[PDB]
A paper describes a structure:
[name], the replication initiation protein of [name], is a member of the HUH endonuclease superfamily, which includes proteins involved in the replication of plasmids, bacteriophages and viruses, as well as proteins with roles in DNA transposition and in conjugative mobilisation of plasmids. These proteins are characterised by the presence of two conserved protein motifs: the HUH motif, composed of two His residues separated by a bulky hydrophobic amino acid, which is responsible for the coordination of a divalent metal cation, and the catalytic motif, containing one or two Tyr residues separated by several amino acids. Each monomer of [name] comprises two domains connected by a short hinge region. The C-terminal or oligomerisation domain (OD) is a helical domain responsible for the hexameric state of the protein, while the N-terminal or origin binding domain (OBD) carries the catalytic active site and is in charge of recognising, cleaving and joining dso DNA.
A new crystal structure for the [name] hexamer was obtained without DNA in the crystallisation conditions. Alignment through the OD region of protomers with this extended helix (chains B or D) against a protomer with a flexible region (i.e. chain A) shows a large anticlockwise rotation of the OBD of almost 180° relative to the OD. As a result of this new arrangement, the OBD of these two chains is positioned over the OBD of the neighbouring protomers, chains C and E, respectively, thereby occluding access to the active site of protomers B and D within the structure and impeding the cleavage activity on the nick site. Therefore, these two protomers must be inactive within this hexamer conformation. Another consequence of the presence of a longer α5 helix in two of the monomers is that the neighbouring subunits (protomers C and E) also present a dramatic change of orientation of the OBD relative to the OD. Since the OBD of chains B and D are in such immediacy to those of subunits C and E, respectively, the active sites of the latter are forced to move closer to the OD and face it, instead of being exposed at the top of the cup-shaped hexamer. The α2 helix faces the outer circumference of the hexamer in subunits B, C, D and E, instead of being exposed at the top of the cup, as in the case of the other two chains, A and F, and in all the protomers of the two structures previously reported. A phosphate molecule bound to the active site is observed in all the subunits of this new hexamer, instead of the catalytic Mn2+ metal ion reported in the other two hexamers.
Numbering used by the authors:
A (entry chain C), D (entry chain E): 3 to 203
B (entry chain D): 5 to 14, 23 to 37, 57 to 79, 86 to 204
C (entry chain B), E (entry chain F), F (entry chain A): 4 to 203
Amino acid sequence: KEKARYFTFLLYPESIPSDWELKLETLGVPMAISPLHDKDKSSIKGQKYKKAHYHVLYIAKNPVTADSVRKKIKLLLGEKSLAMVQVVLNVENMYLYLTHESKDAIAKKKHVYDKADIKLINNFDIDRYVTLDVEEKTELFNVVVSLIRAYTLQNIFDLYDFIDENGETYGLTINLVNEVIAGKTGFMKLLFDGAYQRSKR
Amino acid sequence: KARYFTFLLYELKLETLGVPMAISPHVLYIAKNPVTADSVRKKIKLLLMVQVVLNVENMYLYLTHESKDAIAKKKHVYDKADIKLINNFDIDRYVTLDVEEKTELFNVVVSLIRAYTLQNIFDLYDFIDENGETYGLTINLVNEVIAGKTGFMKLLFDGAYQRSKRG
Amino acid sequence: EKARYFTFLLYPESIPSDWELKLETLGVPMAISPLHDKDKSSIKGQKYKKAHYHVLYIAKNPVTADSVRKKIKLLLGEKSLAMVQVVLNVENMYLYLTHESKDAIAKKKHVYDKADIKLINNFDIDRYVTLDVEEKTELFNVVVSLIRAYTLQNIFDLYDFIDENGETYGLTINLVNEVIAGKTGFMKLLFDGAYQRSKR
Amino acid sequence: KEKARYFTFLLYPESIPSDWELKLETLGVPMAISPLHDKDKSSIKGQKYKKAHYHVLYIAKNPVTADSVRKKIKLLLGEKSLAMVQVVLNVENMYLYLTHESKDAIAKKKHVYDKADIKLINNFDIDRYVTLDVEEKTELFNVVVSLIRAYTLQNIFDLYDFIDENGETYGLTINLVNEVIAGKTGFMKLLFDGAYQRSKR
Amino acid sequence: EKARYFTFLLYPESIPSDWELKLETLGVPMAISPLHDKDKSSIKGQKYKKAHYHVLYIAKNPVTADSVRKKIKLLLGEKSLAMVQVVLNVENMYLYLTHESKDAIAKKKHVYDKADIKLINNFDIDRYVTLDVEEKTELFNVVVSLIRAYTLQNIFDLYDFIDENGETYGLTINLVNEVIAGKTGFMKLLFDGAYQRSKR
Amino acid sequence: EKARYFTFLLYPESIPSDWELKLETLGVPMAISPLHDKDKSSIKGQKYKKAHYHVLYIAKNPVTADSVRKKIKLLLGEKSLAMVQVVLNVENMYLYLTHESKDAIAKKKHVYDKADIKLINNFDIDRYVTLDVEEKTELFNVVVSLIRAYTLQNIFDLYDFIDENGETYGLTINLVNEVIAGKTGFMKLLFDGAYQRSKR
Ligand code: NA
């Protein structure tokens, strides 16, 4: 299933303990807690505001799937604590949505929130998540290698097709691999050469 | 056409355009969109030649005569902070946007080669001749985007070459 | 997987006021960057990135990475850090403390004054660079001799040989990838040689 | 009918009026006049010297045709006053050629002349026309690209032959092609590869 | 901060009697000036500056200046010198040894006898004056025309041509090796051009 | 101040009988001189110096000199040696072991036999001597002529030839690897020429 490093979920005060804030910290995970949403427009005719809720941005180190994260926070708070967990694809925009200031929330006239009420937890630094510095690129590259080995990918088109089909399972996009393999084309040639010989074995 | 321009004169009316600039002890002018240099040079003169800039960094330092052309015949190195900067101009700004559009344009060139199975640089060039504008692309600007990425290019064309023979 | 050089980040908000002195207690050589409080940020609304420190950490023997995780969280406070990465080029990471790497400087980023670097326990940058290059040079020479002995025709055969016998020669897949990066032209020569030699 | 702004042509004292300098200034266009070329050895047999002549560096105000200027000077200076009106591609080499100090002129050990005999008209300043070497290498390259495409040049010998025959039309010599493509051989390989396959179509 | 050519001063007053031999011990080639005992001294007073030597020192591979200073300090004493300076033009520094560089002559400095230069460990200046950019491209262009003229398909054919007719064009095998190093991509294009041209 | 190459004296009078074996205990490579039993002494009337050995000691990493002295004091006795000297040219000291160094020959010191050198812990002099770039450039030019002379079609054929005849031309596998590193494009041109030349 879909595997990513960045996830999000919602919390409602009525159905989680008062101490929820610190129990979130027990996990040792970077998290951004949005300002409480008590002024959101309700789709229910006859109602003014949606139930007050928090948005939570959740960062694992090793890429993990969606159910994993749903499972531990459900265990952490109670089984009546949550429903589903979203996989976040542009965390920079989801961070902005916490204040309804993302390019789509400001676009649909959603209630804006105060960015000072954002509480960051466990050294949440948004900038390290949108940049993917050298150490991350090396791990991503080694992944691409194992993919070319496993599925005997003979050229970059075969690789591209495979990423289109199964990219998210390993946290990969085409524009991502372009960045990762940039300046490594000679290495890329050796792998494709090897794959090529392996497929006439 | 380009976004970075230079010209030379022998203060407030320049701000009237509300367009980023950097005036030396030579004047450097940044358009808001890619625009033709003849156009720009009609506009200043009615206000009060012009050469399109292909690299900003070197001309920023030429406002001091301090880059490789300068070190080649070093003379009369000019002041640093004595520069009039209007309409929020800074150098970090524009070089990092240069980078991002480079990779931008590179990625779309990749998708083109995949989509239409372009086997070599001639087939790519031809496609630019006919359909270039729909993707914001010209021959000279694809040349500048793929310079320094020819090994990447060869990888792509090898792919297309062998996929074409699957059929 | 065991390595010698490591790094991690520290933020002022998450560490006690005596973190520098508590760090030197552990008796390991370390390089600490100047506070990066003027790192220009990509997020369009926070001007500068979170002010932080980079710490260069070198164990004496090749050691586990989570080991390093364990000790610093213990000594500084568990809200202090989360992950320890492992350095492959100390040359650039040492300069990166100051945004004086060629690669980061090529992407600009703010420069800091290297006098604001604090070294702990006689951190000798020249010694770890020189031992890195001659250790990696030998790993390469080892890879060469394996390609000769077993006439390995391409990089897939080499990878397979590593999986089967990597531990015997102190070699992992990810470790050969670092050794042969920037030597692919040499690799091509070796595989070409093996290929023709296997057609004899 | 090719239109450009920079021109050069010959002037013959024999066939121009005494006040010719003052007459040229009236056109109000910047001009550089070479020292009188009276010691150029001539390839015509038996005469040993070329007819004494001046080279004129001509900068029009806006793009204009070559015959346009021919007419302007014929009606100004005389019926046989000038010859070989020519469009200039690099103004700096022509200014150096005025004293036979183009590297291409000294490479043939053409007679060198005194730069102090250069006459400037309407405040011609050479620095106003010099181009940075980086960008000239870029446009010269784009030119070479265009030739390889147009004439389907499959390899560097075919390109060298084309330069031998038609180089001047594009302001190109063998050695300058060598400078331009230095450090771009990977690009060159891509072009010749393209031309090669295209000629098997 | 690494270079190969260095220079520094030595004064007989503050160096051992067998200093010349101790210098040779280091195994690096070096050129030693004639004793500078007659330099007009800008203090006036004593007319001449205290007698001193200039040493031109060539490291085997690039090193720091402090490398060299430390080495001479260990070999000769802490008192023997204060700084080793980095030389950018070996030829001028060699001519300065006798006050015959253009700038020594421009200041009317006392000239010394070139035979009093002491050479150590096969120091030969002609070995370090190399690779003029202007000349390396002209030789290159010559190599190009030879590959065109005689349709030389590969580097063996070129080398054979040099062996037989090199003298005509001022070319030797090793000098071509210098000229084409770092232009091998260009070389390939040329040989491909020749190769296809010989199948016409 | 820390160095890798050291030397010191040992006097039989002041050292244990099993001193040679005790030196092997350290796991450091060492070169021991033939006993200098016939060195002419500047003492009026004594003829010869006290019989002594010179020991060339190769420290594992950069180390301080006093560290090495103390460690020899613990191993052999506190009276075993007095000071440890830093070696600056490892080759020159090794020749000094037999007074076959240029400074020994210049001072006419008694020559000793090279077979009486005792090597310890796989001491090989050729692993410590360093070559200059002019010497590395000629080694490359040498590899070129070998590829020409014996029409070596690939790098395996080249290595095989080095295995068989490397010493004749001052070449080892690993020293070939250093010499051709960063010249793999030139290498491919050479092998192509040899390849096409063998199909002729
Ligand atoms: Na604490």
